[PDB]
């Protein structure tokens, strides 16, 4: 007799949660500008 199949699954796998980092105030317009300069030719700062 033989086996039905070879099932797969996680193995010694790890993960790190990263829920932080946000903007406000200037980000409102920053997004627009950033995109304009990012799409125009390249970033600027």
């Amino acid at each position: 007799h033989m086996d039905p199949l070879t099932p797969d699954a996680s193995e010694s796998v790890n993960n790190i949660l990263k829920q932080s980092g946000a903007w406000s105030g200037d980000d409102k317009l920053q997004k627009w500008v950033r995109v304009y300069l990012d799409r125009g030719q390249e970033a600027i700062k």
Binding site: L29, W32, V33, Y36, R39, G40, K45
Partner: protein
Amino acid sequence: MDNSASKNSAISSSIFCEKYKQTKEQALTFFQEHPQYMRSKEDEEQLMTEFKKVLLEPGSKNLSIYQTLLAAHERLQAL
């Protein structure tokens, strides 16, 4: 926010960079004068996504920021 920072660098060699001034002004002005985000959370969203797609769509990416937003706006309220 204590220990904050606004400046970025004192390397003013390219004029294109200075444009950040006019652009930023046009943004805040259009955002304060017509705060769509305050009118409808969905409106601002659609305008953003479209504003980004309308910027890459055209090949004249070297166009005035006034056209980018202008087109992105009128396009948002297009039939």
